[PDB]
Design a protein around this motif. Structure first.
Motif, mmCIF file in Angstrom:
data_model
loop_
_atom_site.group_PDB
_atom_site.id
_atom_site.type_symbol
_atom_site.label_atom_id
_atom_site.label_comp_id
_atom_site.label_asym_id
_atom_site.label_seq_id
_atom_site.Cartn_x
_atom_site.Cartn_y
_atom_site.Cartn_z
ATOM 1 N N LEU A 268 -51.190 11.422 2.265
ATOM 2 C CA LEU A 268 -51.223 11.491 0.879
ATOM 3 C C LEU A 268 -51.329 12.931 0.318
ATOM 4 O O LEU A 268 -50.533 13.383 -0.479
ATOM 5 N N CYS B 24 -48.268 15.234 0.933
ATOM 6 C CA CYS B 24 -47.124 14.636 0.065
ATOM 7 C C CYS B 24 -46.892 15.498 -1.280
ATOM 8 O O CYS B 24 -46.105 15.929 -1.819
ATOM 9 N N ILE B 25 -48.508 15.400 -1.900
ATOM 10 C CA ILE B 25 -48.612 15.521 -3.476
ATOM 11 C C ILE B 25 -48.335 17.319 -3.599
ATOM 12 O O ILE B 25 -47.714 17.685 -4.446
ATOM 13 N N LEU C 37 -48.456 8.458 -5.858
ATOM 14 C CA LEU C 37 -47.761 9.320 -5.957
ATOM 15 C C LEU C 37 -47.044 9.599 -7.471
ATOM 16 O O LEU C 37 -46.897 10.700 -8.108
ATOM 17 N N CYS D 104 -39.609 12.269 0.567
ATOM 18 C CA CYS D 104 -40.695 12.931 1.290
ATOM 19 C C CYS D 104 -40.585 12.447 2.411
ATOM 20 O O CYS D 104 -40.893 11.154 2.752
#
Lengths: 211, 227, 335, 95, 223, 265, 293
Positions: E109, E112-113, E70, E92
């Motif tokens: 993932l 989250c981004i 991240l 997060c």
């Protein structure tokens, strides 16, 4: 498991189980460190290799300190198993020798980080007594390579699980250890270890002479 | 090295350099000599032969060089110093230069992380400390030392910003909380900086107080280093 | 202006990098060489010694203070990686959950008194992750059975072999320590791991007659369930059968960098293979990590495009370099 | 000559003799002594990547600026003009 | 459904977002620019200290590996030189994974981004470009690519791939690839297939997030 | 440090001369007033509170379990814990080591006063709480363990267990206790300031001393562990063989009297 | 025994009224008294706040502590040591509730009387006085913080050197403005209000009553301290631990009578033993009863 490291399955358990020596020295062979030494000792009994690395003089500002200090980590070998407490004792022992040998007054606000890696010890045939000459040989070399001040080269023998460290050509003693030796060994051991110290003295001086 | 008639060429830890007192006749006349240690030596105490002995004993693996600070002739004071990475053989102290980078700018001062010490140039060393090898220590450049032609009204914002790389001489050890720097001399100041207040092209000194950006076309004012 | 001067004096490479790694890197790059003063597409050489640390280093010595299953020392540059692989015992296609993982600790020494640092922990987990997704160790292989160890009253003891109630599987760790890290270390950790893994042997394991009725009387001061059966299983290393492993799924790593050269910033896109100095670690923000296996199979590529331009042209060259390096290491140590 | 001198000699000869000068049998199974001398790329314990002298060409590139810059650290006209600006201002301080 | 996104939902924090992708559900907050800790003071740069905390059990080593992933992506997304010597903590929290956390991190993932981008848009911190990330698997049954896979499809994967790309000049010209993490077996002809498809499937996702932020921002900011 | 520069030189001079006078003003063979208080836990096997003259206080407590000894190679476990230090600072763990080695089985201490039949040993759990420290604790802990281990009462066996009696766990008499006799070492600390070797440093003395030597007395003689220690960092020097031989000689003479006065309260 | 003292005990962990020693108990409801220290109130009803006696100090009937931390006051002269060195003040440990302050307009300095120092720096402060150094300083003004601004300003004031440290409770010495005096055998005691005691050989500043000006805060231990001088100081400090032990006041005459009484015992380490400390305090009380005070 843990938050700082992976420890795999935790209900899992280990496996249950079923001068007489040559010291050859080396230095200055790995870099990210102010000086390093390598000591490998071979004997009938056991062969061993000890790595040391010394980091700093480092500044430790935000406080004024009277003089510098020395901090010793021993790290458990990858083929030798010891209690954490013994490593502490030996760290404490070595610190008190080094306190006496390293001169500390040219360096205000100093902390020095010394690492003793007790990597390989292997028997072909306590135990922690025997490797004390080798730890003292290693670390001294490292302080010399880096350019850390020293009174005399520090170095020791082991006669009958008894370790005596001297400086000044056998004249002064900077430490004494006896653990599971026999009562009244004193003369044999001191005579025998003086021989050993004078012998490894010059070896360290000759390592320092190739550079 | 020879300096008289009693010196070792090569020395090592725990090896005598010379007696604490000496004597030789030069021109029929004795000159008592009085030896003292400096850096890389210690005067260490001894008993030998049934008497106190005091002696000049090398601490460091090196060449045994003489320098000075200066019976029926004068006593002459001969300092003894055995000179031999090497951040283990210098810590920031007076008369060593350091290479520092501004980790915070402030009203009458600048915190500047020490990333390297210069040998006491032509012989240079790098500190073992890094922000990637862990641990930090800082010293301070003040508003008073920025220049010295005018310096009591030249603020550090007018000559510095964060992230600029500056060469400065350690003026004193000072307080235990900081090292006192001076950038006042005409060989100390910004080694290099990046235009646009530390974000643009790499810029170097094109006047002693201007750094010409090769990507914006404009001068970014500083205090600057010189040879 | 136009006369010139006020550039500072020349600083050595190291000192130059501490001063500005952005600067020092680019300067090196113009002569076409890395900051380690070697050409872009050469690397660091790799030298391994194996069985100089393992229990099973000799045939005439089996000593009980040792238990190191497979082991390698690998030196590249000055950066030295020491790998020891160690077991334990836990009583219990193409699907990811039939392949198992090593549960490593990777310890890095950079002058930090601790050994619980954010840089080393991220390594260790990512390393567990690589081993899972590369599919090396099928769980059938750690799934061992036990024979019988029966003591006789004839003053002898017979430990009876199956062909090598309850069931067991082993687990695998790796204690990897690193001395004097000067660049990206990940690939070093991975290279040594494989030579070790292909040197792993597992102890044999045995149980008594009526194992399912052996008692536990270890817990006390309950409250019920303070007397029960339990299984108890010692391991004996008087024989060790060697690890059953998927060779095709062995990879060997490399590391890459993508970086740009500008001629007015030492006052296009350039590819570096591998990173060795502080200056390269600091400022080569666009980087590709590849694990390539030496038949034109790849078990991970991870591109981190930290800011600079990447055309896929660079990516296309790196996947070939990495397999050819994989083929070099392979033949070099016959493992 | 003096008693000091004699004691000094006895001690110093004692230290010099302590070391002595024996060679060292290696008997190195770890291979650390080759690692110490990384050397060029045509060395020992290095792969090849350039069939030319790797170090020396780099060193040469070092060598061409250094005598030129260290001497000419205040000989250029920019510096000379700047020295005068410092020197004029400097003067009322001294006097 | 496919995807849904909301911003502004949390009120006490400088900016926030809720990203849901089918089963996978991540809620995000950006806090800052705020007062640096001394260990996280960087001279010219904004500091990033990212925390990923899983729904089931407690955060471990895994989330640091994710933090690095991240952090890589986010360092050229957020204009570092916009705030010197300030910290931003991006926190997060995963409200449902709906998969197996150690085994697959593909959906987790990607989510989250996207929630990080949105939260940062709400926060007001400078953003050079649009970033989204899409999850791509390959299933063994057909031995072929399936875009934006469900939980079931993830189980039957042989391999899995996330890509993130930086979107400029109309948010539709791929500037750069900020990530391409391709885990499991692949060979090259698949991989350039994963870029190609990847391109177009990202640009749709960019359209959808783009649209969402306009609609939710527009009754707030009025003239 | 916590003393003055002036104070340390006065001391160095004081102590280093022939008389070796010091703030107590003892000759080198004498010991400060200690107070032994025992048996204050009815719950423990034995317990010990020792208050010394510097106001240092150790509390030492003896708990037990009987265990099969053929799955064990340790019989005495020391846990040291110093108020105001944590459970893993360097000094704390080094004290734990020293003490565990002093008390190590078959080495200056019995491994046959702790066994009641030749298959079952009692694992004695020594648990040491230091209430206040500002001087070294180890000598005081040694002395406290002595009084303790001679106040250690154990369960008396119901009946003479054999190792083939019925091959079940040993089982104790309900009320009747056996007195535990067992002679632990006594650690004695000697201090070197010049060429002068002095028994039992005070706090003040410890802060100027070059080095000390820890040595122990077991069974009518001196024995291992022997260890040197440096009792500061910043007033440290080296020492001679002859001074180490005079410290042997000194303990041999002055130790026996002390063990006999400490034994009977 | 001959070589050790052991007070022998076994079998146990260890070995009327008075004026209001529990707060929560009704001292007075009078609204004119109990307004001062060691009280609190709801209304005028004052319920104590500390343990101690009620007694009239100043102008007010007030709860007065039984024992507690040293309390500074103006006019006191105290012996105490540096805890911290700053850029503008030393922080001084007097054994109080916080630290007392000693600062640059308030300090005589070796090398003149105020010289050898041209700017403030934390270094220049530090060279004279190190952490842990001991020095006799007088209370300049007592502030209501707790904090006390101290001053050194005479050439008798400043560092205490050539001696040995001793210490007691601060309530078992007489409270006076000064208590620093010559005693026989020609040692001088320097005795503050705070319980810290330095005992040194009679030097010029204390010899001039019956000085120095480069030795005010400069480190120097004389080589001219001899055998009998040292022993005098060990015996002196010991007899002071006897009166301390016996929980009575310390006046200068008690020390001289005690010192002489202790000489029936011929060795100085025999005078720290308890049986003797009780004899020495018993002798002094016996002398107080026969004399009439």
């Amino acid at each position: 498991q843990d938050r700082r490291r992976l420890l795999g399955p935790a209900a899992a358990k280990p496996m249950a189980f079923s001068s007489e020596q040559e010291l050859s020295l080396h230095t200055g062979f790995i870099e990210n460190c102010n000086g390093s030494a390598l000591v490998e000792a071979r004997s009938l009994g056991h062969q061993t290799s000890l790595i040391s690395a010394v980091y700093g003089p480092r500044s430790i500002r935000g406080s004024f300190t009277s003089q510098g200090t020395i901090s010793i980590q021993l790290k458990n070998g990858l083929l030798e198993k010891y209690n954490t407490n013994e490593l502490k004792e030996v760290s404490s022992f070595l610190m008190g020798i080094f306190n006496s040998v390293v001169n500390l007054s040219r360096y205000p606000k100093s902390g020095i980080d010394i690492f003793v890696y007790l990597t390989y010890d292997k028997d072909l045939t306590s135990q922690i007594s025997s490797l004390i000459p080798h730890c003292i040989t290693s670390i001294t070399l490292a302080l010399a390579d880096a350019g850390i001040e020293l009174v005399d080269m520090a170095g020791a023998g082991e006669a009958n699980g008894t370790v005596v460290s001297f400086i000044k050509n056998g004249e002064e003693i900077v430490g004494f250890w006896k653990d599971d030796g026999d009562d009244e060994d004193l003369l044999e051991c001191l005579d025998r270890c003086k021989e050993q110290y004078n012998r490894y003295r010059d070896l360290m001086i000759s390592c320092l002479m190739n550079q | 090295m020879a300096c008289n008639f009693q010196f070792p060429e090569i020395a090592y830890p725990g090896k005598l350099i010379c007696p604490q007192y000496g004597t030789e006749n030069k021109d029929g006349e004795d000159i008592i000599f009085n030896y003292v240690p400096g850096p890389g030596t210690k005067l260490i105490q001894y008993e030998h032969n049934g008497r106190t002995l005091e002696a000049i004993t090398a601490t460091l693996v090196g060449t045994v060089r003489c320098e000075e600070e200066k019976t029926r002739r004068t006593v002459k004071n001969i300092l003894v110093s055995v000179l031999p990475n090497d951040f283990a053989n210098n810590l920031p102290k007076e008369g060593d230069i350091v290479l520092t980078r501004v980790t915070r700018l402030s009203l009458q001062r600048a915190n500047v992380e020490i990333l390297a010490v210069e040998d006491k140039a032509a012989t240079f060393s790098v500190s073992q400390a890094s922000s990637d090898l862990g641990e930090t220590f800082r010293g301070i450049i003040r508003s008073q030392d920025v220049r010295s032609t005018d310096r009591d009204r030249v603020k550090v914002i007018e000559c510095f910003k964060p992230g600029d790389i500056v060469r400065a001489q350690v003026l004193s050890l000072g307080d235990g909380t900081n090292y006192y720097l001076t950038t006042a001399r005409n060989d100390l100041g910004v080694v290099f900086a990046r235009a646009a207040n530390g974000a643009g092209g790499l810029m170097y000194a094109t006047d002693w107080q201007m750094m010409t950006s090769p990507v914006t076309g404009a001068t970014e004012k500083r205090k600057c280093a010189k040879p | 202006l136009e006369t010139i001067e006020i550039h500072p004096i020349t600083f050595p490479p190291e000192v130059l990098a501490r001063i500005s790694p952005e600067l020092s890197l680019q300067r090196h790059l113009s002569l076409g060489i890395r900051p380690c003063l070697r050409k872009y597409e050469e690397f660091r050489d790799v030298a391994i010694e194996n069985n100089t640390l393992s229990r099973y280093a000799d045939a005439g010595n089996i000593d009980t203070k040792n238990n190191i299953l497979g082991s390698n020392v690998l030196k590249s540059g000055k950066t030295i990686v020491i790998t020891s692989i160690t077991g334990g015992i836990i009583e219990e296609e193409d699907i990811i959950a039939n392949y198992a993982s090593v549960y490593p600790v990777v310890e890095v020494e950079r002058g930090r008194v601790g050994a619980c640092t954010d840089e080393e922990m991220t390594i260790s987990q990512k390393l567990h992750d690589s081993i899972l997704h590369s599919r090396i160790l099928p769980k059938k292989a750690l799934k061992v059975k036990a024979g019988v160890r029966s003591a006789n009253e004839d003053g002898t003891f017979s430990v009876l072999y199956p062909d090598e109630k309850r069931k067991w599987s082993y687990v695998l760790y790796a204690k990897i320590v690193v001395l004097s890290r000067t660049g990206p270390v990940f690939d070093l950790c991975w290279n040594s791991l494989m030579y070790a893994l292909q040197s792993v042997k597992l102890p044999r394991a045995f149980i008594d007659e009526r194992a399912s009725d052996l008692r536990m009387t270890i817990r006390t001061r309950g409250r019920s369930a303070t007397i029960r059966e339990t299984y108890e299983i010692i391991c004996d290393q008087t024989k060790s059968v060697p690890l059953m492993i998927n060779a095709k799924n062995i990879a060997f790593a490399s590391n890459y960098g993508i970086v740009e050269l500008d001629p007015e910033c030492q006052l296009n896109t350039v590819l570096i293979a591998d990173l060795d100095t502080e200056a390269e670690e600091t400022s080569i923000h666009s980087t590709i990590s590849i694990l390539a296996a030496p038949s034109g199979n790849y078990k991970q590529l991870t591109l981190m495009g930290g800011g600079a331009k990447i055309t896929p042209e660079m990516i296309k060259r790196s996947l070939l370099l990495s397999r050819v390096r994989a083929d070099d290491l392979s033949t070099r140590f016959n493992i | 000559t003096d008693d000091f001198a004699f004691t000094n000699f006895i001690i110093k000869d004692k230290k010099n003799s302590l070391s002595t000068s024996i060679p060292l049998s290696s008997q190195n199974s770890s291979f650390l002594s080759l690692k110490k001398h990384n050397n060029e790329l045509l060395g020992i314990f290095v792969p090849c990547n350039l069939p030319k002298t790797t170090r020396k060409v780099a060193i040469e590139n070092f060598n061409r600026p250094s005598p030129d810059d260290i001497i000419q650290s205040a000989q250029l006209n920019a510096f000379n003009e700047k020295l005068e600006n410092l020197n004029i201002k400097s003067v009322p301080k001294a006097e | 459904m496919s995807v849904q996104a909301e911003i502004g939902i949390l009120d006490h924090v400088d900016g926030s977002s809720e990203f849901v992708s089918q089963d996978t559900k991540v809620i995000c907050s950006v806090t800052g620019p705020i007062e640096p800790k001394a260990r996280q003071e960087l001279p010219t740069q904004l500091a990033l200290e990212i925390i990923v905390r899983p729904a089931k059990g407690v955060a471990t080593t895994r989330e640091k590996v994710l933090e690095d992933k991240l952090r890589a992506v986010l360092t050229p997304l957020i204009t570092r030189h916009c705030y010197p010597r300030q910290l931003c903590q991006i926190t997060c929290q995963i409200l449902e994974s709906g998969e197996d956390e150690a085994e697959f991190s593909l959906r987790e993932l990607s989510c989250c981004i996207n929630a990080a981008f949105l939260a940062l848009v709400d926060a007001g911190i400078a953003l050079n470009s649009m970033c989204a990330s899409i999850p791509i698997a390959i299933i063994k049954d057909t031995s072929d690519i399936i875009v934006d896979p469900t939980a079931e499809q993830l189980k039957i994967s042989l391999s899995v791939h996330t890509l993130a790309l930086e979107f400029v000049n109309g948010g539709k010209v791929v500037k750069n690839v900020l990530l391409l993490d391709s885990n499991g077996d692949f060979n090259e002809d698949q991989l350039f297939s994963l870029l190609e498809l990847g391109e177009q499937k990202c640009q749709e996702l960019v359209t959808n997030i783009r649209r969402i932020i306009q609609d939710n921002i527009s009754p707030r900011l009025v003239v | 440090m916590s003393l003055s520069v002036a104070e340390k030189s006065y001391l160095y001079d004081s102590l280093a001369s022939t008389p070796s006078i010091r703030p107590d003003g003892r000759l080198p063979h004498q010991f400060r007033p200690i107070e032994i208080f025992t048996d204050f836990l009815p719950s423990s096997n034995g317990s010990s509170r020792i208050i010394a003259s510097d106001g240092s206080e150790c509390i030492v407590s003896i708990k037990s379990k009987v265990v099969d000894h053929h799955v064990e190679n340790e019989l005495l476990q020391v846990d040291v814990d110093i108020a105001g230090q944590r459970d893993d600072a360097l000094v704390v763990e080094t004290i734990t080591s020293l003490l565990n080695k002093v008390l190590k089985s078959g080495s200056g201490v019995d491994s046959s006063k702790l066994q009641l039949t030749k298959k079952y040993s009692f694992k004695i759990f020594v648990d040491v709480l230091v209430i206040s420290s500002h001087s070294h604790p180890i000598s005081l802990i040694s002395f406290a363990i002595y009084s303790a281990l001679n106040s250690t009462y154990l369960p008396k066996l119901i009946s003479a267990f054999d190792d083939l009696e019925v091959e079940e766990l040993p089982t104790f008499h309900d009320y009747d206790m056996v007195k535990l006799d067992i002679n632990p070492p006594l650690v004695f600390i000697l201090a070197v300031v010049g060429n002068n070797m002095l028994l039992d440093p005070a706090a003040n003395e410890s802060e100027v001393a070059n080095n000390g030597l820890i040595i122990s007395w077991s069974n009518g003689k001196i024995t291992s562990p022997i260890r040197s220690v440096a009792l500061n960092d910043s007033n440290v020097k080296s020492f001679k063989p002859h001074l180490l031989k005079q410290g042997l000689a000194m303990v041999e003479k002055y130790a026996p009297d002390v063990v006999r006065s400490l034994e009977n309260l | 025994s001959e070589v050790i003292t052991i007070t022998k005990r076994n079998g146990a962990f260890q070995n009327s009224d008075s004026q209001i020693v529990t707060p929560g108990e009704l001292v007075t409801d009078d609204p004119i008294w109990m307004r001062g220290h060691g009280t609190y109130f709801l209304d005028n009803m004052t319920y104590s706040s500390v343990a101690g006696t009620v007694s009239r100090v100043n102008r007010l009937l007030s709860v007065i502590p039984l024992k507690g931390r040293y309390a500074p006051e103006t006019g006191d002269h105290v012996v105490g040591r540096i805890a911290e060195v700053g850029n503008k003040r030393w922080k001084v440990d007097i054994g109080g509730k916080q630290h007392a302050v000693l600062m640059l307009g308030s300090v005589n300095l070796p090398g003149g009387i105020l010289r050898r120092k041209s700017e403030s720096d934390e270094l220049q402060m530090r060279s004279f006085l190190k952490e842990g150094d001991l020095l006799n300083a007088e209370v300049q003004s007592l502030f209501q913080d707790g904090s006390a601004s101290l001053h050194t300003r005479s050439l008798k004031y400043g560092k205490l050197r050539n001696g040995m440290f001793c210490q007691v409770p601060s309530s078992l010495i007489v409270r006076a403005k000064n208590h620093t005096h010559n005693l026989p055998g020609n040692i001088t005691v320097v005795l503050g209000v705070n319980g810290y005691i330095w005992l040194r050989k009679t030097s010029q500043m204390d010899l001039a009553r019956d000085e120095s000006s480069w030795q005010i805060y400069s480190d120097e231990n004389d080589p001219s301290i001899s055998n009998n001088i040292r022993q005098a100081i060990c015996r002196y400090a010991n007899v002071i631990k006897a009166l301390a032990f016996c929980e009575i006041g310390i006046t200068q005459q008690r020390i001289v009578s005690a010192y002489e009484a202790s000489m029936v015992y011929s060795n100085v380490g025999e005078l720290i033993e308890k049986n003797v400390m009780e004899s020495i305090g018993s002798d002094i009380l016996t002398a107080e009863k026969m004399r009439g005070n």
